[PDB]
Amino acid sequence: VVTEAKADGSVLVTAKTISKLRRKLGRHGLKLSKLVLIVSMDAYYDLLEDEEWQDVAQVGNDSVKLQGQVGRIYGLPVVVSEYFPAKANSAEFAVIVYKD
Amino acid sequence: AVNQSSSVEVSSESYETIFSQRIIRDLQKELVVGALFEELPMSSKILTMLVEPDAGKATWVAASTYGTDTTTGEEVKGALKEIHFSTYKLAAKSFITDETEEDAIFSLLPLLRKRLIEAHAVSIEEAFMTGDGSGKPKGLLTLASEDSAKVVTEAKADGSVLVTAKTISKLRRKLGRHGLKLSKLVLIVSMDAYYDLLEDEEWQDVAQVGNDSVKLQGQVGRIYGLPVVVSEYFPAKANSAEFAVIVYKDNFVMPRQRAVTVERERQAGKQRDAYYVTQRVNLQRYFANGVVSGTYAAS
Amino acid sequence: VEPDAGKATWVAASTYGTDTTTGEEVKGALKEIHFSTYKLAAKSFITDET
Amino acid sequence: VVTEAKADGSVLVTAKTISKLRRKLGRHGLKLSKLVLIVSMDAYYDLLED
């Protein structure tokens, strides 16, 4: 996609990365959810001080409070992974499929 | 006493009024570290155990070298790091003499026992939060000094301070490792930092643009889903800790070889009844991880 | 009124000669308070003629 | 505590004043989540533009 942010250094992750990743993914690749979103441990933390629509307050959530963020991110489940290397030019997300 | 003004009838002197023997009590700290951490009973002086290290990687074949042909790497040849739990001890005493209860009121005996246990309770509670290393164990606020847990900076050291909800998110970004899934973490905040948190204007503001209904009945102690614990044992405003967060899942256990015993001697003394009390309870962590303190440096 | 804290201390580890290591504590020194009371009064009058 | 309002006029008294004001008294304070609040009769009719 190159580039949203700048490796923490003045602006962090934003909820419209997932829309752009979904847009460029595989054209006809949808059919509701049924798509798996792997998120770095780092990237999970800066999307939690939001300031975006999928919040833990009331801005546009499903009433989450209880627990500390939920798998609703464009209808996708959130899968954590801590195995990611240097934070500079690396990937922090993976959008992958399992229907074929 | 009956003086000021005594006019014009009976003047007399001073002490001419009934006195009351009843006591009253002001402030107290509420005790949140001395009764929150699992007791480990043990019959010795030091307790030891082994624990594994992690990976332990296994190398893949070089896409030609499939046979024998050895070279496949190997995993971790030395392992099972030992961990030792030391125990620390303390004592107090207070000694009364007959000469200061006969000319008095005959009431000082039960109050002394209440006071020495409170003084002991204050002393252990400060030591668990703030402590050094020599003679008395190291405390929780400086637990996060040796592992590089710290951050610089949060709020602005008395020039337009605010303690806004993004602080705790940045603090957990700084801790990071290895369990984001809410394993019942314990968080303790300063007296002033707790008061400052209701000026906000962030996440749980004065309007229903931010928070859902959670206050109930009006500005109550609720942060990011979790309740918040407050304490008056933080040092006065400066470059120190105003907020401490610790993981509680395997760790922060207190070893102890007895409970509180309080006794008295006066034989073969001369006069005095002398109260003694002794203790042996301390604070340690199995693993050097899961601890952060903000700090709150300068801006 | 009963008084404020109240601090104990920890042993030098090695010591065992009794040697209590306790510092000493402030046995039964406290502080008194007292209540003092003021008087409020009025007087007003009326004449037979009105 | 100094300052919020400056002689009304163009800067009026709004409900955030009682947040910073109680930074040394009650809720929690001594141990009690209760207080009584008294306001001026004219100041009561200022607290309508917030």
Curated annotation (Swiss-Prot), chain D:
Major capsid protein that self-associates to form 120 hexamers and 11 pentamers, building the T=13 icosahedral capsid which about 860 Angstroms in diameter. Responsible for its self-assembly into a procapsid. The phage does not need to encode a separate scaffolfing protein because its capsid protein contains the delta domain that carries that function. The capsid gains its final stability through the reorganization of the subunits that takes place upon expansion. DNA encapsidation through the portal triggers capsid expansion and the binding of the decoration protein to the capsid exterior. This is Major capsid protein. Disulfide bonds: none annotated. It comes from the Viruses. It is found in: Virion. The chain holds residues 310 to 359 of 458 of the full protein. Interacts with the decoration protein; each hexon binds a single copy of the decoration protein. Interacts with the portal protein.
